Amino acid sequence: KLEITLKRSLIGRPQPQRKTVQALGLGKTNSVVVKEDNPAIRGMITKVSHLVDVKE
RNA sequence: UCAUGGAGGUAGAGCACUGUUUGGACUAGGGGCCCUUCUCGGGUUACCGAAUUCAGAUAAACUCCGAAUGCCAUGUACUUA
Ligand SMILES: [Mg+2]
Ligand SMILES: [Mg+2]
């Protein structure tokens, strides 16, 4: 598993990034999510790594 | 989002066509000095010169090529509304 925290804002960020975030299950900043380590999920990571911190 | 399959001819690159073009080889032909002379045909001139050909450049309306992305979808994948 891995822990996904939303540290940057979505304001000024394109809707693809926003939708990736909402699909990860994130809302407000400094919000935490715990997910599996599927490559599907790692793709959402690698599309929004600039907004996110990942822990395992 | 991941995987998979696809249309598509952009960026770039390239010259395989089309145009634009540089240098060289080489020339139909035009101009002159003429030899002549029914100026017929030659000596021919680097004074030009269609084209042809070798190498090298160029292209929104050129393409032998050709991505990233984006798009169409499929899935049981994994989240989410
Ligand atoms: Mg170009
Ligand atoms: Mg073009």
The string of DSSP letters for A1-56 reads -EEEEE-S-STTS-HHHHHHHHHHT--STTEEEEE---HHHHHHHHHHGGGEEEE-
Question: Any atom of strand B under 7 A from CB of A7?
Answer: no
Give the nucleotide nearest to A26 (CA→C1'): B80
Neighbouring residues of A45: CB distance < 8 A, sequence distance ≥ 6: A4, A52, A54
Ligand 2 center from residue A56 Cα (angstroms): 49
Question: Any atom of strand B under 7 A from CB of A54?
Answer: no
Distances (CA, A) of A22 to A7, A25, A41: 14, 5, 12
Note whether A30 and A5 are within 8 A (CB): yes
Question: Any atom of strand B under 7 A from CB of A25?
Answer: yes
Range of the domain at A49: 1-56
Number of domains into which chain A is organized: 1
Note whether A23 and A12 are within 8 A (CB): no
